[PDB]
Design an enzyme around this catalytic site. Structure first.
Site, PDB file in Angstrom:
ATOM      1  N   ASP A   1       0.814  -1.213   0.000  1.00 15.12           N
ATOM      2  CA  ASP A   1       0.000   0.000   0.000  1.00 15.12           C
ATOM      3  C   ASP A   1       0.848   1.264   0.000  1.00 15.12           C
ATOM      4  O   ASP A   1       0.534   2.223  -0.716  1.00 15.12           O
ATOM      5  CB  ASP A   1      -0.946  -0.003   1.199  1.00 15.12           C
ATOM      6  CG  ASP A   1      -1.993   1.087   1.111  1.00 15.12           C
ATOM      7  OD1 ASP A   1      -2.915   0.972   0.278  1.00 15.12           O
ATOM      8  OD2 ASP A   1      -1.903   2.053   1.896  1.00 15.12           O
TER       9      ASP A   1
ATOM     10  N   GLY B   1     -10.620  -3.164 -13.431  1.00 16.99           N
ATOM     11  CA  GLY B   1     -10.824  -4.219 -14.402  1.00 16.99           C
ATOM     12  C   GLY B   1      -9.630  -4.525 -15.280  1.00 16.99           C
ATOM     13  O   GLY B   1      -8.547  -4.852 -14.786  1.00 16.99           O
TER      14      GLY B   1
ATOM     15  N   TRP C   1      -8.478  -6.795 -18.991  1.00 14.80           N
ATOM     16  CA  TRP C   1      -8.717  -8.137 -19.515  1.00 14.80           C
ATOM     17  C   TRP C   1      -8.415  -9.212 -18.479  1.00 14.80           C
ATOM     18  O   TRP C   1      -9.255 -10.077 -18.207  1.00 14.80           O
ATOM     19  CB  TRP C   1      -7.894  -8.361 -20.782  1.00 14.80           C
ATOM     20  CG  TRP C   1      -8.048  -9.744 -21.334  1.00 14.80           C
ATOM     21  CD1 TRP C   1      -7.226 -10.812 -21.111  1.00 14.80           C
ATOM     22  CD2 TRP C   1      -9.113 -10.223 -22.159  1.00 14.80           C
ATOM     23  NE1 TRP C   1      -7.699 -11.920 -21.770  1.00 14.80           N
ATOM     24  CE2 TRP C   1      -8.858 -11.586 -22.420  1.00 14.80           C
ATOM     25  CE3 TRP C   1     -10.254  -9.631 -22.710  1.00 14.80           C
ATOM     26  CZ2 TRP C   1      -9.706 -12.371 -23.204  1.00 14.80           C
ATOM     27  CZ3 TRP C   1     -11.097 -10.412 -23.491  1.00 14.80           C
ATOM     28  CH2 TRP C   1     -10.817 -11.767 -23.731  1.00 14.80           C
TER      29      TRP C   1
ATOM     30  N   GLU D   1     -14.496  -6.421 -19.267  1.00 20.04           N
ATOM     31  CA  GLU D   1     -14.418  -6.975 -20.614  1.00 20.04           C
ATOM     32  C   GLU D   1     -14.946  -8.408 -20.606  1.00 20.04           C
ATOM     33  O   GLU D   1     -14.162  -9.349 -20.494  1.00 20.04           O
ATOM     34  CB  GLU D   1     -12.981  -6.906 -21.125  1.00 20.04           C
ATOM     35  CG  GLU D   1     -12.243  -5.606 -20.762  1.00 20.04           C
ATOM     36  CD  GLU D   1     -10.868  -5.486 -21.419  1.00 20.04           C
ATOM     37  OE1 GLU D   1     -10.604  -6.224 -22.399  1.00 20.04           O
ATOM     38  OE2 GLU D   1     -10.062  -4.634 -20.967  1.00 20.04           O
TER      39      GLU D   1
ATOM     40  N   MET E   1     -12.229   0.708 -27.144  1.00 20.82           N
ATOM     41  CA  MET E   1     -10.977  -0.029 -27.319  1.00 20.82           C
ATOM     42  C   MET E   1     -10.809  -0.460 -28.780  1.00 20.82           C
ATOM     43  O   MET E   1     -10.730  -1.640 -29.115  1.00 20.82           O
ATOM     44  CB  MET E   1     -10.930  -1.217 -26.368  1.00 20.82           C
ATOM     45  CG  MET E   1     -10.727  -0.789 -24.918  1.00 20.82           C
ATOM     46  SD  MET E   1     -10.670  -2.151 -23.743  1.00 20.82           S
ATOM     47  CE  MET E   1     -12.412  -2.492 -23.536  1.00 20.82           C
ATOM     48  N   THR E   2     -10.723   0.541 -29.659  1.00 23.20           N
ATOM     49  CA  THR E   2     -10.629   0.295 -31.098  1.00 23.20           C
ATOM     50  C   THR E   2      -9.202  -0.103 -31.488  1.00 23.20           C
ATOM     51  O   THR E   2      -8.518   0.540 -32.283  1.00 23.20           O
ATOM     52  CB  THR E   2     -11.121   1.504 -31.880  1.00 23.20           C
ATOM     53  OG1 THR E   2     -10.744   2.710 -31.203  1.00 23.20           O
ATOM     54  CG2 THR E   2     -12.641   1.443 -32.028  1.00 23.20           C
ATOM     55  N   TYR E   3      -8.765  -1.201 -30.882  1.00 19.53           N
ATOM     56  CA  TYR E   3      -7.523  -1.865 -31.233  1.00 19.53           C
ATOM     57  C   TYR E   3      -7.714  -3.340 -30.910  1.00 19.53           C
ATOM     58  O   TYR E   3      -8.788  -3.759 -30.474  1.00 19.53           O
ATOM     59  CB  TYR E   3      -6.324  -1.255 -30.491  1.00 19.53           C
ATOM     60  CG  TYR E   3      -6.594  -0.908 -29.042  1.00 19.53           C
ATOM     61  CD1 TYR E   3      -6.741  -1.911 -28.086  1.00 19.53           C
ATOM     62  CD2 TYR E   3      -6.681   0.415 -28.622  1.00 19.53           C
ATOM     63  CE1 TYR E   3      -6.984  -1.609 -26.758  1.00 19.53           C
ATOM     64  CE2 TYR E   3      -6.919   0.731 -27.292  1.00 19.53           C
ATOM     65  CZ  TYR E   3      -7.071  -0.289 -26.366  1.00 19.53           C
ATOM     66  OH  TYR E   3      -7.311   0.009 -25.044  1.00 19.53           O
ATOM     67  N   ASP E   4      -6.664  -4.129 -31.116  1.00 16.74           N
ATOM     68  CA  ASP E   4      -6.759  -5.584 -31.015  1.00 16.74           C
ATOM     69  C   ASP E   4      -7.830  -6.136 -31.945  1.00 16.74           C
ATOM     70  O   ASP E   4      -8.423  -7.181 -31.672  1.00 16.74           O
ATOM     71  CB  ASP E   4      -7.039  -6.043 -29.581  1.00 16.74           C
ATOM     72  CG  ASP E   4      -5.862  -5.825 -28.655  1.00 16.74           C
ATOM     73  OD1 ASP E   4      -4.740  -5.553 -29.137  1.00 16.74           O
ATOM     74  OD2 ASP E   4      -6.072  -5.934 -27.431  1.00 16.74           O
TER      75      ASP E   4
HETATM   76  C1  LIG Z   1      -5.216  -4.169 -23.573  1.00 21.71           C
HETATM   77  C2  LIG Z   1      -4.433  -4.971 -24.609  1.00 21.71           C
HETATM   78  N1  LIG Z   1      -5.032  -6.255 -24.937  1.00 21.71           N
HETATM   79  C3  LIG Z   1      -5.118  -7.378 -24.021  1.00 21.71           C
HETATM   80  O1  LIG Z   1      -4.701  -7.287 -22.917  1.00 21.71           O
HETATM   81  C4  LIG Z   1      -5.738  -8.682 -24.546  1.00 21.71           C
HETATM   82  C5  LIG Z   1      -6.770  -8.674 -25.499  1.00 21.71           C
HETATM   83  C6  LIG Z   1      -7.294  -9.921 -25.973  1.00 21.71           C
HETATM   84  C7  LIG Z   1      -8.358  -9.973 -26.939  1.00 21.71           C
HETATM   85  O2  LIG Z   1      -8.913  -8.784 -27.444  1.00 21.71           O
HETATM   86  N2  LIG Z   1      -8.817 -11.214 -27.350  1.00 21.71           N
HETATM   87  C8  LIG Z   1      -9.829 -11.219 -28.271  1.00 21.71           C
HETATM   88  C9  LIG Z   1     -10.352 -12.425 -28.739  1.00 21.71           C
HETATM   89  C10 LIG Z   1      -9.814 -13.621 -28.245  1.00 21.71           C
HETATM   90  C11 LIG Z   1      -8.781 -13.582 -27.306  1.00 21.71           C
HETATM   91  C12 LIG Z   1      -8.297 -12.306 -26.871  1.00 21.71           C
HETATM   92  N3  LIG Z   1      -7.284 -12.277 -25.953  1.00 21.71           N
HETATM   93  C13 LIG Z   1      -6.764 -11.094 -25.485  1.00 21.71           C
HETATM   94  N4  LIG Z   1      -5.751 -11.063 -24.569  1.00 21.71           N
HETATM   95  C14 LIG Z   1      -5.208 -12.320 -24.065  1.00 21.71           C
HETATM   96  C15 LIG Z   1      -4.437 -13.081 -25.152  1.00 21.71           C
HETATM   97  C16 LIG Z   1      -4.954 -14.264 -25.644  1.00 21.71           C
HETATM   98  C17 LIG Z   1      -4.274 -14.961 -26.625  1.00 21.71           C
HETATM   99  C18 LIG Z   1      -3.070 -14.481 -27.116  1.00 21.71           C
HETATM  100  C19 LIG Z   1      -2.547 -13.300 -26.624  1.00 21.71           C
HETATM  101  C20 LIG Z   1      -3.232 -12.600 -25.644  1.00 21.71           C
HETATM  102  C21 LIG Z   1      -5.244  -9.921 -24.106  1.00 21.71           C
HETATM  103  N5  LIG Z   1      -4.166  -9.955 -23.128  1.00 21.71           N
HETATM  104  C22 LIG Z   1      -2.955  -5.132 -24.236  1.00 21.71           C
HETATM  105  C23 LIG Z   1      -2.564  -5.302 -22.914  1.00 21.71           C
HETATM  106  C24 LIG Z   1      -1.216  -5.428 -22.591  1.00 21.71           C
HETATM  107  C25 LIG Z   1      -0.249  -5.385 -23.586  1.00 21.71           C
HETATM  108  C26 LIG Z   1      -0.639  -5.217 -24.906  1.00 21.71           C
HETATM  109  C27 LIG Z   1      -1.989  -5.092 -25.230  1.00 21.71           C
END
Ligand SMILES: C[C@H](NC(=O)c1cc2c(=O)[n+]3ccccc3[nH]c2[n+](Cc2ccccc2)c1N)c1ccccc1
Ligand SMILES: C[C@H](NC(=O)c1cc2c(=O)[n+]3ccccc3[nH]c2[n+](Cc2ccccc2)c1N)c1ccccc1
EC number: 3.2.1.14
Lengths: 496, 496
Positions: B66, B93, B95, B142, B210-213
């Protein structure tokens, strides 16, 4: 279970007021024409039509002579001596009274509006039934709209309650008082109430699908008015059911309502079977005892699927009676509608007609090469395929409009009774053809399937199948981490 | 109104517990890296992450020291001296904590269930905010599923009430306490709660998309993870929103959710704007400060839209670190994710990478001809089109994940601030390109239309347009005798 055979008896107010059994010039089809043999081939006679008056009660046409009308009904109920299973129903409505622009449409909307109006209307139905000696109530509103459906249904429930009480009070357990409606037989009108079919059918003994008038002068291209299956060469239609207030997803709407589709009798039957709570045994297939005539058709396909120059106005706007040989059309002053009886005498009278057959729709049609006429109708041979369909789909039976249009020998009614009940008739090898079937799938006709039980905590890929809460579900995309029904990723695709 | 610039500051528990500003091997991006100049370029810092514990209260990770956590927060809140508009938010929160299979997911589901649990959780949010000196609350679940949305929304409403009261109690009218969430930026996760966007957004100051990934190792085909507009040559996706519990008809769903569609940033923004009650000023476009790497790609288009051999398991299952030059991937034991700072140094090191540009998506990408590698990321030039988009669409501003991934000069953050506020930057002539736009139409974006008023008693042909009760309606088929909105025949196509 013996199949229902429901024949409408229609008689205009004028014919009631001048009723006679000895003169076809005023009454073409008196009750006397229904011999004991015909009464035994019927299970129900729908006397038609009664109406809802501005007092929002069931009543006769205000111009009806009550004494003559009571006598006609008594002539009909007397037929029960020849058939202890026969019911003489009465029908409220019809196109003329109850259509959106019909004389009495507002009375139907208002009668079902409130609990008080529904109780008053429902009581009037039972009262009319008991006072005149009828055996049940048939409602033929064409058609209630979406905001009127719930009130319409509460009225049917209320009539069911009082009929069941009246059956016990009258000791009619052997032949209970019945409640039926005529339902739409095509997707356009069906879409008005389609979403609430289950609650509509629940209080009914039968829903009589008006699986005819699927073609007519209101359509630009000529077609079969009661095709059993589809013909790819014929016209196709927008599937209005995909716009019904169902609350289903895009996949569910698409799989259930392919569009465009062939407007057929099989289509209307399958569309009812696709909804949960609509048992096949309550579905009755309507068939026409009349033909619809078009003029100004082209050649090359017996008059099928051609543009035409038939007036579409109601009533018939001219005095040009261009259906050769149909002097019954002259009496009724409309050459667009001809009874099967009239059509038979047109075929045997050397008027230039050929009886052709479409082996995909399984329906006959007449073509007049000289004057360019086309007639779509049904006969004993089309009824063979429809009767087998009724049996295969475990439907409740058959309905037809109407008795007065059969030939004087009653062959159409006899054919229907034969195909259902004759011990020496065997349709096990009758060829249902290769005409198009309605392939939609909905919640009420999901196929039986097997799948592994759903496991919480599992991640499913696209296309995975699992069983859950009684159904088999499929994922529409990948990485699914929640349970079926919890998530829009799962689609119901199978049963048990 | 100044556009929001919301930068996430994420720091794992181990880095907090061993916090140092003098050793990048232990803390790669200490708060010291945010100079007064950088602090003036931010409007919000989302400190991340906090969690919901099993007592259904907001709390730090139980393993957090803390005193060290307070020290980290104080270094962020001290930045407020250099920018009187800056807010140091904290996010609950992420992921890892809140995904369906995450360690604490049940705590989120249970916290929002009842008035008592929501009140207890909301009070814990304000108590954490005041105790540590934060300026607002950000929720990053999420994602809530359909049955949890109403409870989630009542929880957001309850936090809003206590924040508004806390603003009055503390005399913070000049800088009120704020409430935000990050929402899904792609249709699949968005479909869980899409129907209730208006009530979700109503208590919020911003929803940070979150218009990325939008691409990653979980997809079979390589693609840009944050394309602004679509590339017809790239892959397309099933439009999950058409499966959401919207209660729309087939035509409306089809008009709103064309499928397949290009999974882009413009898609996610337009899909939010299609819903009534979602103001553009509350929508914040997220952008990534990191890149996503794939191996085993083919040639012919710089590695775009190719199959690949990238593992998708989480965590990374091996020690095969095939991203040449990414020393940080070696430290983090994952060759699939690389910060922009690291990607910059890979380009500066003669490691075999080429920076290519896609002028449809308006995003850069790296291609490694020798080992078959592909990297999708964003940079200062892609931010030029996204910043102009933010201004054209009157969005609330920009968000990014995350601060620690910028280079030490802070070029990515400085680029965003420049494009919004610098008097010497002029994007009035910047060509947004010919990439695919999301063309869906829903209730929140119905065009203004003009049509003659509907006339009761009229029969309409198919395609007729009328105005009635505030909308312009179109008939989907002919012979229409009912009122717009009364019937499945009428389609809402415009507003009056
Ligand atoms: C915030 C951002 N994004 C995630 O934190 C994340 C987003 C997904 C995802 O959209 N998503 C969508 C569909 C299916 C699975 C999946 N999984 C995700 N995983 C976990 C993951 C799973 C498999 C392979 C790599 C990572 C994640 N950590 C981030 C955080 C830290 C560093 C870089 C980027
Ligand atoms: C019961 C059966 N059918 C009708 O009672 C009827 C059915 C439609 C109809 O489906 N329909 C569907 C779509 C558009 C209009 C329209 N109109 C209808 N009109 C009115 C009408 C209009 C034009 C020409 C003739 C009759 C009708 N009477 C019948 C009655 C008497 C004799 C033979 C058969």
């Amino acid at each position: 279970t013996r199949k229902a055979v429901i024949g409408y008896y229609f008689i205009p107010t004028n014919q009631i007021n001048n009723y006679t059994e000895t003169d076809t010039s005023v009454v073409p089809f008196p009750v006397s024409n229904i011999t004991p043999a015909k009464a035994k081939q019927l299970t129900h006679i729908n006397f038609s039509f009664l109406d809802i008056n501005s007092n929002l009660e069931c009543a006769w046409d205000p111009a009806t002579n009550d004494a003559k009308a009571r006598d006609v009904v008594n002539r009909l109920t007397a037929l029960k001596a020849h058939n202890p299973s026969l019911r003489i129903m009465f029908s409220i409505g019809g196109w003329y009274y109850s259509n959106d622009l019909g004389v009495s449409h507002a009375n139907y909307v208002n009668a079902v509006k409130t609990p008080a109006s529904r109780a008053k209307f429902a009581q009037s139905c039972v009262r009319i039934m008991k006072d005149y000696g009828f055996d049940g109530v048939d409602i033929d509103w064409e058609y209630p709209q979406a905001a009127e459906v719930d009130g319409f249904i509460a009225a049917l429930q209320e009539i069911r309650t009082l009929l069941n009480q009246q059956t016990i009070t009258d000791g009619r357990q052997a032949l209970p008082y019945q409640l039926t409606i005529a339902g739409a037989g095509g997707a356009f009108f069906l879409s008005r109430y389609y979403s609430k079919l289950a609650q509509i059918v629940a209080p009914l003994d039968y829903i009589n699908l008006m699986t005819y008038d699927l073609a007519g002068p209101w359509e630009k291209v000529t077609n079969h008015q009661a095709a059993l299956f589809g013909d790819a060469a014929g016209p196709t239609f927008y599937n209005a059911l995909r716009e019904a207030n169902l609350g289903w997803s895009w996949e569910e709407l698409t799989r259930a309502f392919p569009s465009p589709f062939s407007l057929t009798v099989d289509a209307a039957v399958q569309q009812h079977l696709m909804m949960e709570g609509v048992p096949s045994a309550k579905i009755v297939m309507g068939v026409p005892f009349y033909g619809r005539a078009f003029k100004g058709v082209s050649g090359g396909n017996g008059g099928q699927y051609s543009s035409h120059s038939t007036p579409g106005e109601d009533p018939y706007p001219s005095t040009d009676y261009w259906l050769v040989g149909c002097e019954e059309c002259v009496r009724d002053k409309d050459p667009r509608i001809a009874s099967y009886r009239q059509l038979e005498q047109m075929l045997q009278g050397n008027y230039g007609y050929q009886r052709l057959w479409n082996d995909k729709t399984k329906t006959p049609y007449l073509y007049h090469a000289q004057n360019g006429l086309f007639v779509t109708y049904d006969d004993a041979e089309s009824f063979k395929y429809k009767a087998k369909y009724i049996k295969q789909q475990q439907l409740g039976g058959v309905m037809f409009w109407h008795l007065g249009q059969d030939n004087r020998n009653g062959d159409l009614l006899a054919a229907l009774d034969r195909y259902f009940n004759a011990a020496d008739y065997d349709d096990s090898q009758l060829d249902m053809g290769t005409g198009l079937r309605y392939t939609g799938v909905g919640p009420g006709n999901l196929p039986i399937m097997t799948a592994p039980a759903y496991v919480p905590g599992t991640t499913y890929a696209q296309g995975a199948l699992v069983s859950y809460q009684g159904y088999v579900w499929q994922t529409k995309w990948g990485y699914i981490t929640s349970a079926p029904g919890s998530d829009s990723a799962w689609l119901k695709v199978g049963r048990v």
